[PDB]
């Protein structure tokens, strides 16, 4: 019972609060120089970022970049299947059992 | 690395205790990654989002009908006149 | 510039037509670039939703 909810609070504009929008704002639109900059860099052979190379030298363990449809969107993923180690003996602990009640060295 | 049952933020995610799942996603992950922004999401367009600029919209125009007025109006003084009595200004600036 | 414009659009209606076409072409090219950047942003938002 969470989807398609009713208007729970009121919507209003306080007197004389500014809007900062002119009358041609709807015709205004955004723009980024990033696409044009990338085109120009590719055409002029300008320095490329290392994200274009899938291998990652930023760590000692092997990482490979996974790209989401573009070189600008990538995530490094580790290749190793890391081996983990435990300097611990087995069968030396029973946490469910209350040990303060049993008589013995482990109890004390 | 001392109080594991009491420090759950430093513990593995519940998908790690499950023993089941080119390159694959890691099998072991911690909850401490929640304390990083770009741990799981990518850093795409990271230093390019503050570069999308939009210009202001103020127009400095106001008709100035002086034919309506026949009297002068008061005007402010913004700065002290340093072109006269320049040498004594630090000495008489505090008076009135 | 004024000569080259009046040489090809000597009348007010033609000047207005040319100005409107210029506006429309500018807006269309800007829209193409913005569509590309919007596809990128949409991918990033989808990855945030996935996270």
């Amino acid at each position: 019972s969470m989807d398609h909810g009713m208007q729970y609070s009121s919507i209003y504009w306080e007197t004389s609060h500014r809007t900062y929008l002119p009358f041609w704002a709807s015709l205004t639109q955004k723009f980024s120089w990033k696409i044009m900059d990338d085109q120009i860099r590719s055409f002029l052979r300008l320095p490329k970022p290392v994200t274009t190379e899938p291998f990652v030298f930023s760590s000692g363990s092997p990482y490979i970049r996974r790209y989401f449809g573009d070189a600008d969107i990538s995530v490094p993923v580790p290749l190793h299947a890391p081996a983990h180690f435990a300097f611990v003996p087995t069968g030396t602990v029973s946490p469910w059992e209350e040990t303060g009640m049993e008589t013995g060295p482990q109890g004390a | 690395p001392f109080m594991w049952r009491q420090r759950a933020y430093c513990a593995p995610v519940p998908s790690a205790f499950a023993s089941q799942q080119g390159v694959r996603k890691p099998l072991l992950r911690s909850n401490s990654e929640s304390l990083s922004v770009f741990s799981q999401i990518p850093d795409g367009l990271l230093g390019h989002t503050t570069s999308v600029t939009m210009g202001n919209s103020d127009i400095f125009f106001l008709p100035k009908p002086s034919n309506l007025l026949k009297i002068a109006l008061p005007a402010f003084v913004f700065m002290p006149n340093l072109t006269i009595f320049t040498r004594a200004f630090p000495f008489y600036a505090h008076t009135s | 510039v004024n000569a080259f414009v009046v040489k090809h659009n000597p009348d007010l209606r033609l000047q207005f037509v040319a100005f409107a076409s210029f506006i429309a072409t500018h807006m269309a090219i800007t829209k193409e670039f913005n569509d590309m950047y919007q596809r990128l942003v949409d991918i990033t938002s989808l990855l945030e939703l996935q996270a």
């Binding site: - | 570069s51 999308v52 202001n56 | -």
Partner: peptide, 21 residues
């Protein structure tokens, strides 16, 4: 002159960033 100065002041000298989603 006022329109020219406003255009310049707004779109060359008073540009500020805006979020994009």
């Amino acid at each position: 002159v006022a329109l020219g100065a406003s255009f310049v002041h707004d779109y060359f000298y008073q540009r500020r960033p805006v979020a994009w989603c």
